[PDB]
């Protein structure tokens, strides 16, 4: 009660305070100027006419004119006018056009697309270790590759070797490789994109590889960044049969993805996290290295690991009075972390049902048998015995 109150006091007062000052000051910005900053506003509003169309700047033409491509089929011949100079514009940049007579207003789109909003995350994960149950060595490796060069370059200076350009996570299903990536994303204080790897794949000629290219384009500008692309067995080399639309698509996306990642001078400071679940469909030109510079195997928990996952989860569940943790982990063999996460939620559930306001021993043991049914192989003592 006292610990919560202490945090709650500081964060409510200041944030509520920052809110109230913004209200008062916002009015107060305006009064100083009225003809000293006002003038630029009046001239833009008149030239723009308010309605405006986009154009893409095709090229410049020497005499303060330019030629633009509209989103409609005809191109048009524009003149370069207004405040925005032609050293602030180059070909390959988006421009705004005036309604009545198409004219270079200036740029303000800055090559926006609705896919940038999707790349861009705003949601923040939990997530740090001490919510990651064991795998000490695995925690360490991803921290040295992805967290560390950014925070401390000092070690990288002293030795004088380039920093890891990526890491690839692979292993058994449901191992919770996803926590570790999330944990990296929270702690860094870096621009975190992603995306799912199933989002670059479409069916429309040439749109797919350009969406691949776009991720890097946004990262390289707002570098250092980290890019997490999930599920690379949705963008492998695999068969595609015949009489399919998607047979070209899968080929092209992957190709563009490959060049950008290697660079030709590279981004040089954007690290990547790839995660995947089938390594028998992965292409061979993406796990050879300069791309990725560790490769790490995840495996299902063992006794020490299980006790840690378990250990964190039970402390967030009330009254484990007659509950011994050790006796459960001993009997359990060959399970995922997913299965232990599940057993805590199930065991609490049985405690509710018992008409009991607390968990027991017997609530836990019943739940444990249930989840062993789900993940089972027996051909070890079937073959042997």
């Amino acid at each position: 009660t006292r610990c919560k109150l202490k945090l709650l006091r500081m964060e409510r007062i200041k944030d509520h305070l920052l809110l109230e000052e913004e209200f008062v000051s916002n009015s107060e910005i305006l009064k100083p100027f009225e003809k000293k900053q006002e003038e630029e506003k009046k001239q833009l509003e008149e030239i723009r006419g308010n309605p405006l169309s986009i154009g893409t700047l095709e090229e410049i033409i020497d005499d303060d004119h330019a030629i633009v491509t509209s989103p409609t089929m005809p191109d048009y011949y524009v003149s370069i006018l207004s405040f925005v100079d032609k050293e602030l514009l180059e070909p390959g940049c988006s421009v705004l056009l005036h309604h009545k007579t198409m004219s270079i207003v200036g740029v303000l789109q800055d090559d926006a697309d609705p896919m940038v909003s999707v790349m861009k995350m705003d949601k923040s994960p939990t997530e740090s270790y001490s919510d990651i149950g064991g795998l000490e060595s695995q925690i360490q490796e991803i921290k040295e590759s992805v967290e560390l060069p950014l925070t401390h370059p000092e070690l990288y200076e002293e030795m004088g070797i380039k920093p890891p350009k990526g890491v690839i996570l692979y292993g058994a299903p449901g191992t919770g490789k996803t926590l570790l990536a999330k944990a990296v994303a929270n702690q860094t204080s870096a621009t975190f994109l992603r995306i799912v790897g199933s989002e670059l794949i479409q069916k429309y000629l040439g749109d797919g590889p350009r969406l691949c290219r776009q991720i890097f384009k946004v990262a390289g500008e707002n570098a250092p960044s980290i890019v997490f692309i999930d599920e690379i067995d949705a963008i492998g080399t695999k068969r595609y049969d015949s009489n399919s639309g998607g047979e070209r698509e899968i080929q092209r996306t992957m190709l563009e993805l490959l060049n950008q990642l290697d660079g030709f001078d590279d981004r040089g400071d954007v690290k990547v996290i790839m995660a995947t679940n089938k390594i028998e469909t992965l292409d061979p030109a993406l796990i050879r290295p300069g791309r990725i510079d560790r490769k790490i195997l995840f495996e299902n928990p063992d006794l020490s690991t299980k006790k840690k996952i378990l250990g964190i989860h039970t402390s967030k569940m009330n009254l484990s009075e007659d509950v011994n943790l050790e006796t459960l982990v001993t009997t359990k063999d060959d399970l995922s972390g997913a299965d232990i996460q599940a057993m805590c939620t199930e065991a609490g559930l049985l405690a509710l049902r018992e008409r009991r306001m607390q968990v027991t021993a017997e609530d836990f043991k019943q739940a444990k048998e249930r989840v062993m049914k789900n993940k089972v192989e027996e051909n070890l003592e079937g073959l042997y015995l």
């Binding site: 030795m159 380039k162 890891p164 796990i287 290295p289 300069g290 510079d293 490769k295 195997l297």
Partner: protein, 53 residues
């Protein structure tokens, strides 16, 4: 792969980095090959007979 040959020197360097040592021994390059090769074997051809021999 010649690329993975480049990755040896980087990885060897990683071992010197966490050890806080200001140089890279002969020993830690031994580890650096061992990690890359042993990982790669996971995908293609496993095992040796020099695990007891």
């Amino acid at each position: 792969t010649g690329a993975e040959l480049r990755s040896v020197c980087t990885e060897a360097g990683m071992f010197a980095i966490r050890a806080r040592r200001k140089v890279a021994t002969e020993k830690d390059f031994l580890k650096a090959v061992d990690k890359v090769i042993s990982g790669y074997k996971k995908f293609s051809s496993t095992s040796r007979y020099m695990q007891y021999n």
